[PDB]
Amino acid sequence: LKAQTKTEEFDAIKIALASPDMIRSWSFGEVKKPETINYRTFKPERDGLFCARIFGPVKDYECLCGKYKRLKHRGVICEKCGVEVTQTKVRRERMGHIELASPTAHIWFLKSLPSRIGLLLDMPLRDIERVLYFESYVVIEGGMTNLERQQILTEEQYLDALEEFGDEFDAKMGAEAIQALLKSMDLEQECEQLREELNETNSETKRKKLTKRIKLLEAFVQSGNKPEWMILTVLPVLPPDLRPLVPLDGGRFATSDLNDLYRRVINRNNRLKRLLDLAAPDIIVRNEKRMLQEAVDALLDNGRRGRAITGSNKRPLKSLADMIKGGKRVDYSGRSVITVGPYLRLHQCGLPKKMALELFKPFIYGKLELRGLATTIKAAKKMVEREEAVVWDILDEVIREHPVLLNRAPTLHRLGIQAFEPVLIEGKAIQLHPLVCAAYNADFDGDQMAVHVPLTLEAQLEARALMMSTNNILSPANGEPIIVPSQDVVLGLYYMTRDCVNAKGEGMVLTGPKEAERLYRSGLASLHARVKVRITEYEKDANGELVAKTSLKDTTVGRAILWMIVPKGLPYSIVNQALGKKAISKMLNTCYRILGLKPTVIFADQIMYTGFAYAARSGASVGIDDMVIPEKKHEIISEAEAEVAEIQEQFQSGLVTAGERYNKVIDIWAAANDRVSKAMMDNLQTETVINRDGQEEKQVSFNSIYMMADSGARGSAAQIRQLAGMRGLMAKPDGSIIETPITANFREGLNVLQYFISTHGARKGLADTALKTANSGYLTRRLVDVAQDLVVTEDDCGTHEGIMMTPVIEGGDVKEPLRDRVLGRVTAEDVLKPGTADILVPRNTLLHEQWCDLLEENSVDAVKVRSVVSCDTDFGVCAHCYGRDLARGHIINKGEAIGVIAAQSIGEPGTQLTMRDITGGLPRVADLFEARRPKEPAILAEISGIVSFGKETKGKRRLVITPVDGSDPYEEMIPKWRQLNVFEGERVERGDVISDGPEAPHDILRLRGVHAVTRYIVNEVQDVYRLQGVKINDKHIEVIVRQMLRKATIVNAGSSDFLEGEQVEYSRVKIANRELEANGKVGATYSRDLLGITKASLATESFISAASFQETTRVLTEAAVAGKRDELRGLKENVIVGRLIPAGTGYAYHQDRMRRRAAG
Amino acid sequence: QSQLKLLVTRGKEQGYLTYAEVNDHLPEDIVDSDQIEDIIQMINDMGIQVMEEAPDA
Amino acid sequence: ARVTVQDAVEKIGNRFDLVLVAARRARQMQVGGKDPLVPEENDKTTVIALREIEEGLINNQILDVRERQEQQEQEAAELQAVTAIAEGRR
Amino acid sequence: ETLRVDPTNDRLSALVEIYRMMRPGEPPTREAAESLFENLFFSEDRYDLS
Ligand SMILES: Nc1nc2c(ncn2[C@@H]2O[C@H](COP(=O)(O)OP(=O)(O)OP(=O)(O)O)[C@@H](OP(=O)(O)OP(=O)(O)O)[C@H]2O)c(=O)[nH]1
Ligand SMILES: [Zn+2]
Ligand SMILES: [Zn+2]
């Protein structure tokens, strides 16, 4: 016995047409005057666009006149002027209406792609539906003689037909004519007769329009909306506050364009009302009606036809629709320039004193008044406004364990916003941990980040348990660590290895920590020798725990002292025995997988501190003599120019093909470039001589630059090759290459010519960079919009099927293996073993248990694994079928947000993608996801049969292949263009190649199989990242392809109406509820359909979510026609409404509320 | 005939949606702000089937 | 749990419910009946709840049960007033 | 081929067709259809290559 009549909690919102009486329900009065504000008193007019009696009072609680002032009469209206004295915010919510004389057509339901008023009535839009209501050609409204029911007549035809009959087929013209036309229309009887007629002896020559309109008519009649509301007779008014005329600075009012529109429509409507009382000339009144139509159409939605103007501005007027067709500023926030903070930890950030003072203002107030000090709230304000020392100490209390999350401008992925613990710093800049400075893709060029203060209690815990930097150790994209040490730190730890012979070396042995005393006390060097020491190692096995292992290994000084940083576990020494390069991340990785979170974090801090400290101790610099040029440079150049000279001389005397000597001479300079590069590298690498004991030996150059190159720290082969070697073949604006490479280098001088040549590369480089940077996000938006609705739910469902995972092998003719694509994956079912047993059924491939897939030899290179592609889930994703790949080591928590994380991870490396039988680059990725047919698509055999010619070019035609076997034939169409691959008589299988060209994803999914098409997409999208060298897990690709295969097409006979292509969501849930419901014959069989990201995102349940990205004017209108309702599980549509997101910290709320909405 | 065959045969699918093309191959008085929306609505979005909803309209 | 917080999730799966229950307990402490279990040591209510969960005490079923006892204590112990009001409108 | 697809046949129909192409609205006359085309490429006040 509920039935409450207040503003409580809503479970859904409904959209539909509005009746004239429905408009009256919102009406708090009727605007009748074009007047707005008084010219002198600046007071709201009687019944103008800004009435006080109709809408709301100007001041809060005092009326218009002033008979009543204070809160004494808040429920009683004024005597002299019916003004309800409540609030001033009432003026913001009060509606109101205008009641027009002659009917008027709504611009949306009239001319918006399909003629909603036309298609429902079956009548031409801008052709017939225009001329009959613009007062030109009269229309019929049902005739029982000579005239049909919807024909168009002229005035001559009208009077003639009227004279022949008349007084028994009356049919007006104009707006009200179309009104009676829609009103007289019977949706029910037409729904019956149309179903009857559009089914009688008709092939595929009619079925199109038949099924279309019948579904549309059925939708409209079931919607509840009456076709009468199609053209409005009462036009509601938007609240004054949402279109105010506020005085600016020194007079000069500022009003909205809507006021101009409403003022115009009011004027024309009034004159129309006055003309229908005075003399009534047909031409004058009919014109005023067309003018009234103009005003209304302009107010509702300008668009669209010439564009109304006035208001002095040459620019159009922002209509109602224009204000809702096409960034959330927030309190408790700030921003500033970032700065490196070495002394900081991994979970801390440098927050400015004055900045943090203003941020936690309300918290400082409360805490002050809590302890004492400030007698009141305003006392705290005056106490912090006058920074009185003691207040700062209070600040140290409020920001104690109150996390603050930082954010960078280019937010590509989830690690764009990470939380930290605030640490007061005497300065006006924000300091950041140099480790998480890579996740942000942030540099200190002058970049500035923003800070937000988690106000809510659970918001603070959200920032601490989710957005905290310590919880984001591994990248969401690839399982590898993200906080891995970079340039400076890695260079330092690289210097802490690097075994140099002799030089204060000798094998003076000690015991770990003791060696530290040796280093500070000079005597011995640091990069020697090697030298032996006692290492107390620690390992565990089977029953875990710890097993000591003291030994005597031959390391170095650096390795020994650096060994102290290494945590309890780890293989020890051997991780330090190497050097500093890429294993620097490997060590961090293994430390995480064998120990845990905290140990990995402290290990990261220690290796960072150590790296920085010893890096400073090293004093590695970059002099001009550090980049040594090869002596054989001029030799190589002369030899190369000698060869090209011979080639040019040959070209002079014919002989060689002059048409392509350009290419071969390029090979000459290119080969020469490799000669110089190889020479420089072989030189700058080794070198040195030292003098070990009896002298004479060779190691590797301690040449700073090389040290930077052989240890990450921003230094690649190509760059170094340009520093001392030479800049090779340079690009030309034509797209061609110049046959005179930059012989010189940056170490040497650069001629004006070759620099004016390199300026092109730099220009196109920056230009292309600017393009792909915005284009990457351009792709990300489509990815997110289509995927940001699926969330891992229902724990872990059943099913065993799943793509058979195999190492991506180009080794067929090039040799290239990759077999790490199986880890943290939930096994399908006991994937065999050369003998028996072994792998379990649903056992997720552990990080240590994937190394067990090497103890089964190279024989086992194929394992069936559950993926998001398959999964017999409904509206979510099985936890097992997904994986575990996060910053977390375990499986994805139930109710995460796979969609956005997947899309982000995909569009994150988009910045480093070079746009162009191999397209390659970002455009290749876009084409693969959009599922576009190639420029020369191949063809396959749909059914296995016998290949034979089907009448050599007898059409039309063009060759024809007919693979017929078993039963029934097929006639494919070959257009002569492009050859073949299978002779006549030969047999083919189900999906064989008969064109040997580019394959179309649609054909693969349609014929080959879902596993095949998904394998195709993932293995083709990776191949463009292989070349770009961007590591990204296949899971996310499988995630987007999952809902990429959202909808399908049924072909048989069931409760669903055949031709309708519907998503496998309702399909599967309904086919499961039909085999054991009444009969399996009341349902049909479906067939998966491949549709691109854009095409897939276009279709969605919520009309609000759709109103977001795609054209609002369309979706909102069509959703208005049929009584649709969002209810209401989508992420996007639940964001603009301002409520808990149906995922993450929420979900449980939505789950409880979802089950709660089952009672009624 | 003319409008239908030209629109369909040409736009397949004009790749970058070459708007400044067929709008000149249309009769009647030009430079209008009315026929502008009726072409940007048919090319994309509801592809294939929309190109059959255009001629009929 | 000043740095994971990861050691608490394995005590109650899905970090999200961890946040909910932890926020629940922290809500009890910050306003109303405080009484922490793990020693404060000058820490905010944000982390105190997490430390308790890590300690092994204060979970979801625990809080719900203690809420049941709390309701049975406020209601059953003060029914003499409600029963006297029940005779108000017969 | 250009002549084959040319509706106009004289000077009047040409200027009228151009007048209807440039200013779609009012009925093309004699003075307007001529003066319009003249004030396009044959008048300093309406056309100038400097
Ligand atoms: N895992 C865990 N760590 C805790 C816990 N309580 C405190 N810590 C550690 O406390 C350390 C900081 O100690 P302090 O810098 O002196 O601050 P405290 O005054 O100790 O606060 P306290 O009383 O302990 O809560 C951190 O160092 P770090 O080594 O992490 O920072 P890093 O590795 O970067 O050095 C935390 O790990 C806890 O309940 N769980
Ligand atoms: Zn009053
Ligand atoms: Zn599943």
The full 3-state SS of A327-378, as one line of letters, equals CCCCCCEEEEEEEECCCCCCCEEEEEHHHHHHHCHHHHHHHHHHHCCCCCHH
Q: What tokens does A792 get?
A: 């891992």
Asked if A771 contacts A921 with a C-beta cutoff of 8 angstroms, the reply is no
Tokens 């394992």 belong to residue: A863
d(CA A236, CA A23): 6
d(CA A986, CA A969): 15
Asked if A134 contacts A128 with a C-beta cutoff of 8 angstroms, the reply is no
Instruction: Name the nearest CA neighbour of A1093 among A904, A930, A967.
Output: A930
3-state secondary structure of A730: coil
d(CA A262, CA A237): 8
3-state secondary structure of A1007: helix
Chains A and C touch (3+ CB pairs under 8 A): yes
Instruction: Name the nearest CA neighbour of A702 among A495, A502, A493, A528.
Output: A495
Burial label for A37, CB within 10 Å (0-12, 13-18, 19+), is middle
Backbone angles phi, psi at D37, to 5 degrees: -70, -30
Q: Does B24 touch chain A (CB under 8 A)?
A: no
Asked if A507 contacts A532 with a C-beta cutoff of 8 angstroms, the reply is yes
Asked if A298 contacts A319 with a C-beta cutoff of 8 angstroms, the reply is yes
Is there an atom of ligand 1 within 6 Å of A345 CB?
Answer: yes
Instruction: State the CB neighbour count (10 A cutoff) for residue A673.
Output: 22
Task: For strands A430-432 and A333-340, give the pairing.
Answer: parallel
* Amino acid letter, A835: G
d(CA A292, CA A272): 8
The packing angle between helices D31-41 and D11-22, to 10°, is 70
Q: What tokens does C53 get?
A: 């969960």
- How distant, in Å, are the alpha carbons of A25, A37, A322, A892, B5 from that of A242? 20, 16, 14, 45, 48
Q: What tokens does A991 get?
A: 């999906």
Q: What tokens does A538 get?
A: 């620690």
CATH of the domain at A650: 1.10.132.30
Adjacent-strand bridge partners of A864: A804
3-state secondary structure of A43: coil
d(CA A320, CA A867): 47
A112, A113, A1002, best to mutate vs chain B, most B CBs in 10 Å: A113
B12, B34, B39, best to mutate vs chain A, most A CBs in 10 Å: B34
Q: Omega of the bond prior to A958 within 30 degrees of 0, cis?
A: yes
Q: Please report the sign of the dihedral spanned by the C-alpha atoms of residue A270, residue A273, residue A277, residue A281.
A: positive
The separation between CA A793 and the C-alpha centre of its own chain, rounded to angstroms, equals 21
Is there an atom of ligand 1 within 6 Å of C8 CB?
Answer: no
d(CA A321, CA A107): 10
Interchain contact, B37 vs A304, CB within 8 Å:
yes
Sequence-ordered list of residues with C-beta below 8 angstroms from that of A150, at least 6 positions apart, any chain: A121, A122, A123, A139, A140, A181
Phi and psi based region of residue A948 (left: phi greater than 0; alpha: psi -120 to 50; beta: remaining):
beta
Provide the H-helix boundaries in A387-506.
Answer: 390-398, 457-465, 487-495
Pocket test for ligand 1, best of A396, A595, A602, A612 (most atoms within 8 A of CB): A602
d(CA A357, CA A391): 9
Q: What is the DSSP string of A289-302?
A: HHHHHHHHHHHH--
Asked if A535 contacts A551 with a C-beta cutoff of 8 angstroms, the reply is yes
The most distant pair of C-alpha atoms in chain C lies apart, rounded to whole Å, by 60
Asked if A317 contacts A260 with a C-beta cutoff of 8 angstroms, the reply is yes
- How distant, in Å, are the alpha carbons of A400, C8, C18 from that of A468? 15, 15, 15
**What resolution in angstroms, rounded to 1 decimal?**
4.2
The protein residue with its alpha carbon nearest to ligand 1, atom 10, reads: C2
The protein residue with its alpha carbon nearest to ligand 1, atom 20, reads: C41
Interface of A with C in 871-900 (CB under 8 A): 888, 890, 893-895
Length of chain B: 57
- Determine the distance separating the centroid of ligand 1 and the alpha carbon of A546, expressed in angstroms: 24
Interface of A with B in 292-321 (CB under 8 A): 303-307
Q: What number of helices (H) and strands (E) belong to chain D?
A: 2, 0
- Nearest by CB to A347, from C3, C13, C43: name it: C3
- Determine the distance separating the centroid of ligand 1 and the alpha carbon of A357, expressed in angstroms: 25
- The torsion of the CA quartet A1048, A1054, A1057, A1062, rounded to 10 degrees, works out to -20
Q: Please report the sign of the dihedral spanned by the C-alpha atoms of residue A511, residue A513, residue A514, residue A518.
A: positive
The most distant pair of C-alpha atoms in chain A lies apart, rounded to whole Å, by 130
- Nearest by CB to A1098, from B42, B45, B57: name it: B45
Ligand whose nearest atom lies closest to the CA of A64 = 2
Q: What tokens does A667 get?
A: 């090979």
Is there an atom of ligand 1 within 6 Å of C2 CB?
Answer: yes
Asked if A218 contacts A271 with a C-beta cutoff of 8 angstroms, the reply is no
Provide the H-helix boundaries in A619-652.
Answer: 633-652
Asked if A440 contacts A408 with a C-beta cutoff of 8 angstroms, the reply is yes
Sequence-ordered list of residues with C-beta below 8 angstroms from that of A954, at least 6 positions apart, any chain: A960
Q: What is the DSSP letter of D28?
A: P
For residue A741, give its domain range: 624-772
Q: What tokens does C66 get?
A: 């203690």
Instruction: State the CB neighbour count (10 A cutoff) for residue A1038.
Output: 25
Q: What number of helices (H) and strands (E) belong to chain C?
A: 4, 0
Q: What are the structural domains of chain C?
A: 1-89 (3.90.940.10)
Tokens 């994209």 belong to residue: A477
Q: Which residues of B touch A316 (CB under 8 A)?
A: none
- How distant, in Å, are the alpha carbons of A1021, A1064, A1067, A1074 from that of A1081? 41, 18, 15, 8
3-state secondary structure of D35: helix
Q: What tokens does A1147 get?
A: 């979900």
Closest atom of ligand 1 relative to the C43 alpha carbon:
25
CATH class of B1-57: mainly alpha
Closest atom of ligand 1 relative to the C54 alpha carbon:
39
Provide the experimental method for this PDB entry. Answer: X-ray
In degrees, rounded to 5, the angle at the alpha carbon of residue A243 between the alpha carbons of residues A240 and A249 is 105
Beta strands per DSSP E along A426-540: 430-432, 448-452, 529-539
Instruction: State the CB neighbour count (10 A cutoff) for residue A913.
Output: 22
Asked if A642 contacts A691 with a C-beta cutoff of 8 angstroms, the reply is no
Instruction: Name the nearest CA neighbour of A68 among A92, A52, A46, A55.
Output: A52
Is there an atom of ligand 1 within 6 Å of C51 CB?
Answer: yes
Interchain contact, C16 vs A1148, CB within 8 Å:
yes
Q: What tokens does A824 get?
A: 């943290």
- The torsion of the CA quartet C53, C59, C63, C69, rounded to 10 degrees, works out to -110
Provide the H-helix boundaries in A788-921.
Answer: 879-882, 898-907
* Amino acid letter, A421: E
Tokens 């770009």 belong to residue: A1028
The packing angle between helices A257-275 and A282-300, to 10°, is 160
The packing angle between helices C15-30 and A457-465, to 10°, is 140
Sequence-ordered list of residues with C-beta below 8 angstroms from that of A486, at least 6 positions apart, any chain: A434, A435, A437, A438, A712, A713
Q: What tokens does A954 get?
A: 């007898």
Tokens 């009435």 belong to residue: A51
Length of chain D: 50
d(CA A154, CA A575): 94
d(CA A429, CA A518): 40
Q: Does A1111 touch chain B (CB under 8 A)?
A: yes
- How distant, in Å, are the alpha carbons of A113, A118, A238, A1151 from that of A127? 14, 11, 33, 51
Interchain contact, A304 vs B45, CB within 8 Å:
no
d(CA A501, CA A527): 8
**Pairs of residues, one from chain A and one from chain B, whose beta carbons lie less than 8 Å apart:** 28
In degrees, rounded to 5, the angle at the alpha carbon of residue A803 between the alpha carbons of residues A802 and A804 is 110
Sequence-ordered list of residues with C-beta below 8 angstroms from that of C31, at least 6 positions apart, any chain: none
Beta strands per DSSP E along A433-520: 448-452
C18, C19, C48, best to mutate vs chain A, most A CBs in 10 Å: C19
Length of chain C: 90
Tokens 């140990």 belong to residue: A599
d(CA A937, CA A974): 12
Beta strands per DSSP E along A1091-1133: 1125-1126
Sequence-ordered list of residues with C-beta below 8 angstroms from that of A121, at least 6 positions apart, any chain: A150, A178, A181, A182, A185, A227
Phi and psi based region of residue A522 (left: phi greater than 0; alpha: psi -120 to 50; beta: remaining):
left
Chain breaks in chain A (C to N over 2.5 A) after: 326, 916
Task: For strands A547-556 and A804-805, give the pairing.
Answer: unpaired
Backbone angles phi, psi at A549, to 5 degrees: -165, 80
Q: Does C10 touch chain A (CB under 8 A)?
A: yes
d(CA A908, CA A408): 14
Adjacent-strand bridge partners of A805: A863
Asked if A803 contacts A1015 with a C-beta cutoff of 8 angstroms, the reply is yes
Give partners of A (≥3 CB pairs < 8 A): B, C
Q: Omega of the bond prior to A432 within 30 degrees of 0, cis?
A: no
Instruction: State the CB neighbour count (10 A cutoff) for residue C9.
Output: 23
Q: What tokens does D10 get?
A: 């004289």
Task: For strands A448-452 and A333-340, give the pairing.
Answer: antiparallel
Burial label for A873, CB within 10 Å (0-12, 13-18, 19+), is buried
Q: What number of helices (H) and strands (E) belong to chain B?
A: 2, 0
Adjacent-strand bridge partners of A336: A449
- How distant, in Å, are the alpha carbons of A1102, A1104, A1124, D1 from that of A15? 11, 10, 6, 57
- Determine the distance separating the centroid of ligand 2 and the alpha carbon of A767, expressed in angstroms: 66
Tokens 């060779």 belong to residue: A698
Pocket test for ligand 1, best of A601, A606, A612 (most atoms within 8 A of CB): A601
d(CA A854, CA A807): 13
Asked if A364 contacts A437 with a C-beta cutoff of 8 angstroms, the reply is no
Q: What is the DSSP string of A792-857?
A: B-SS--------EE-----TTTT------S-SSPBBSS----SSS--S-SS-B--TTTSGGGGTTT
Closest atom of ligand 1 relative to the A597 alpha carbon:
1
3-state secondary structure of A452: strand
Is there an atom of ligand 1 within 6 Å of C47 CB?
Answer: no
d(CA A34, CA A52): 15
Sequence-ordered list of residues with C-beta below 8 angstroms from that of A268, at least 6 positions apart, any chain: A288, A291, A292, A294, A295
Binding site residue list of A: 63, 65, 78, 81, 443, 445, 447, 797, 871, 878, 881
3-state secondary structure of A1089: coil
d(CA A903, CA A787): 7
3-state secondary structure of C84: helix
Terminal-residue alpha carbon distance, chain C: 56
Q: What tokens does C85 get?
A: 């009001």
Q: Please report the sign of the dihedral spanned by the C-alpha atoms of residue A144, residue A148, residue A152, residue A157.
A: negative
Interchain contact, A1111 vs B56, CB within 8 Å:
no
Asked if A690 contacts A501 with a C-beta cutoff of 8 angstroms, the reply is yes
Interchain contact, A306 vs B38, CB within 8 Å:
no
Q: What tokens does A988 get?
A: 């083919």
Ligand whose nearest atom lies closest to the CA of A83 = 2
Provide the H-helix boundaries in A466-534.
Answer: 487-495, 514-520
- Determine the distance separating the centroid of ligand 3 and the alpha carbon of C16, expressed in angstroms: 21
Terminal-residue alpha carbon distance, chain A: 12
Q: Please report the sign of the dihedral spanned by the C-alpha atoms of residue A549, residue A551, residue A554, residue A558.
A: positive
CATH of the domain at A1126: 1.10.150.390
d(CA A766, CA A770): 6
